[PDB]
């Protein structure tokens, strides 16, 4: 990975030393990008429900609530800052039958092995914390499992590296990791720069209906929604309806 500052460097250090799990996988991969494409074809609004426990609700109950509606779940497995775990990942992936994104700070191959062995269907990769060669190598490694990883971009330089290595599945955070805040203006700009054959997923804390169709008409394939659904989980039924 690169050398970073602040909590993010602590997390990268922690991730580098994270022990690998001895679990072996319990069910097939349920492809997240492919299910999004299927939902697009069928005109079903595609929502990744984003859970996390803490940042710099019961996770199983959340996952079961969202299962009938979400295109996938994002499950945070970073431990120190987000209070995530591998065991919770495992127990969600064994409890619901929709795709699971392992949302973490992946800086080595064994973390992708951990994702596969725990039941996750794909992993997050973050351009900002990796070199281009690392990103490419981790991209190919994930694809070895049948996982198209979800590539996180925060700015146009991140986008350009993602496209340079051939990414096919991108999440647009447009986030300053120092503040945890999303630049929604930049997000719209970046979405408008991504080629049509890349599955594109903005992260939204809140939405309004106007905003959802304006983004759909920019070609967005799915929406990953955090705060609104933690507050009001029932909103995902409205989104599907």
State the number of CA atoms in the 13 A half-sphere of 165 facing the CB: 25
Name the CATH superfamily, with its identifier, for domain 1-241: Aldolase class I (3.20.20.70)
Which residues on adjacent β-strands are paired with residue 185? none
Which residues on adjacent β-strands are paired with residue 176? 181
Backbone phi, psi, residue 67, to 5° = -45, -45
User: What is the distance of C-alpha 132 from the center of its chain?
Assistant: 19
Which H, E and C letters describe the chain, residue by residue? CCCCCHHHHHHHHHHHCCCCCCCCCCCCCCCHHHHHHHHHHHCCCCEEEEECCCCCCCHHHHHHHHCCCCCEEEEECCCCCCCCCHHHHHHHHCCCCCCEEEECCCCCHHHHHHHHHHCCCEEEEEHHHCCHHHHHHHHHHHHHCCCCCEEEECCHHHHHHHHHCCCCEEEECCEECCCCEECHHHHHHHHCCCCCCCEEEEEECCCCHHHHHHHHHCCCCCEEECHHHHHCCCHHHHHHC
The Cα–Cα gap between 75 and 103 comes to 5
The Cα–Cα gap between 172 and 190 comes to 7
60 token code pair: 């199983």
Backbone phi, psi, residue 14, to 5° = -65, -40
User: What method did the depositors use to determine the structure?
Assistant: X-ray
The Cα–Cα gap between 163 and 169 comes to 10
Residue 196 sits at the vertex; the CA angle it makes with 203 and 207, to the nearest 5 degrees, is 25
Strand pairing of 181-182 and 175-176? antiparallel
Domain-wise residue ranges, the chain? 1-241
- Comparing CA positions, the residue from 230, 198, 202 lying closest to residue 37 is 198
Experimental resolution (Å): 1.1
């Amino acid at each position: 990975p690169r050398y970073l500052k602040g909590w993010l460097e602590d997390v990268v250090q922690l991730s580098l030393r994270r022990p690998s799990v001895h679990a072996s996988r319990q069910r097939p991969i349920i492809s997240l990008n492919e299910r999004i494409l299927e939902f697009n074809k069928r005109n079903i609004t595609a929502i990744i429900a984003y859970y996390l426990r803490k940042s710099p609700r019961d996770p199983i109950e959340y996952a079961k609530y969202m299962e009938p509606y979400a295109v996938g779940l994002s499950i945070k497995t970073e431990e120190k800052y987000f209070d995530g775990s591998y065991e919770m990942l495992r127990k969600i992936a064994s409890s619901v039958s929709i795709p699971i994104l392992m949302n973490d700070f992946i800086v080595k191959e064994s973390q992708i092995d951990d994702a596969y062995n725990l039941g996750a269907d794909t992993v997050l990769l973050i351009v900002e914390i990796l070199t281009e060669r690392e990103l490419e190598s981790l991209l190919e490694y994930a694809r070895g499992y049948g996982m198209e990883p979800l590539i996180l971009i925060n700015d146009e330089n991140d986008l350009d590296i993602a496209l340079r290595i051939g990414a096919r599945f991108i999440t647009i955070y447009s986030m300053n990791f120092e503040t945890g805040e999303i630049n929604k203006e930049n997000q719209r700009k970046l979405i408008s720069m991504i080629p049509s054959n890349v599955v594109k997923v903005p992260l939204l804390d809140f939405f309004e209906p106007n905003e959802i169709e304006e983004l759909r008409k920019l070609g967005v394939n799915a929406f990953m929604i955090s705060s609104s659904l933690m507050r009001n989980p029932e909103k995902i039924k409205e989104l599907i309806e």
